[PDB]
Structure 1
């Protein structure tokens, strides 16, 4: 069986991504190097912490490959700062408050939860090439062994 590849909206290229301390970046700024964008549901949860620390454990290998990592959730910069102060992630956390980046990658899903319908981030990750192409995607991500799988995919597509 086969499926259709992801098509990002043209506006995604320079969407300003809110980081900490009134600073920001863009996907455009990452051209020339591999990029891993991982979306997680909520700051300070066991799953978000484990996924982030797993990427921390592999950062030296990602760095060797010249790749950069960006974690993303809809939480505020303040929330990210707290999460950051407690776990110490060696990479930036994007505060996608207006869900612009989440919608671009189509990770916002509606699910029957807590006795009602809830819109939120479906844990997903994307690997982008130095040329800005989405090379591989992971949706409905299971945290265990995920960062390992992303690094393995990177190595398979690169050198």
Structure 2
């Protein structure tokens, strides 16, 4: 079953991708989709996470699954990040945090004497039918991509 219910409109949100094209979650119907959210392009943790998923791409292909990385950085930033690291999967430029809010990854914390909001590293597995069947929040990068792959294989049966 679904572990998270997304607003219906979420599936038709135009998602800006590195490379200049757009996609939508509905467009990915028919196959598994891994959506991993990270705070910022080109940082140590997010570079490690991106490279980890990239190295496992063939394994995800074996399952027919697709991967999408997401942050609120610009398409230009994503293009530079992807080109420098050699990513072979798209990065979503969720500049207005529409997708982030849908998955509720924008968390609030009392810090610096006020309320500070930010993207919490999180990952989700979307089934071929468009259901969010597994979620990982407050993600620890080390070994994460390996865990997501294992879970995907378990779900795909």
Bigger mean CA offset, 138-147 vs 16-25: 16-25
Distance 1:49 1:115 in 2: 30
Query: CA offsets, 1:15-68, max 9 Å, x none?
Result: 000013431000011000000000000000001000000001110000010000
When normalised by structure 1's length, the TM-score is: 0.93
Query: Which 4+ stretches in 1 moved above 6 angstroms?
Result: none
Aligned residue for 2:56, secondary structure, equals helix
Corresponding residue for residue 48 of structure 2: 50
When normalised by structure 2's length, the TM-score is: 0.94
Distance 1:46 1:20 in 2: 20
Distance 1:35 1:71 in 2: 11
Bigger mean CA offset, 104-113 vs 45-54: 104-113
Distance 1:110 1:4 in 2: 24
Change (3 A) 1:29 1:108: same
Distance 1:67 1:113 in 2: 38
Unaligned runs of 5+ in 2: none
Q: Tell me by how many angstroms 1:111 deviates.
A: 2.2
Distance 2:111 2:44 in 1: 19
Q: Tell me by how many angstroms 1:119 deviates.
A: 1.2
Distance 1:38 1:4 in 2: 17
Bigger mean CA offset, 135-144 vs 18-27: 18-27
Q: Tell me by how many angstroms 1:140 deviates.
A: 0.3
| Higher relative contact order, chain-length normalized (CA < 8 Å, sep 6+) | 2
Change (3 A) 1:11 1:51: same
Change (3 A) 1:5 1:20: closer
Aligned residue for 1:5, secondary structure, equals coil
Q: Tell me by how many angstroms 1:117 deviates.
A: 3.5
Corresponding residue for residue 68 of structure 1: 66
- Checking the alignment, whether the CA contact within 8 Å between 2:3 and 2:135 is kept in structure 1 is no
Note the aligned Cα RMSD (angstroms).
1.7
Unaligned runs of 5+ in 1: none
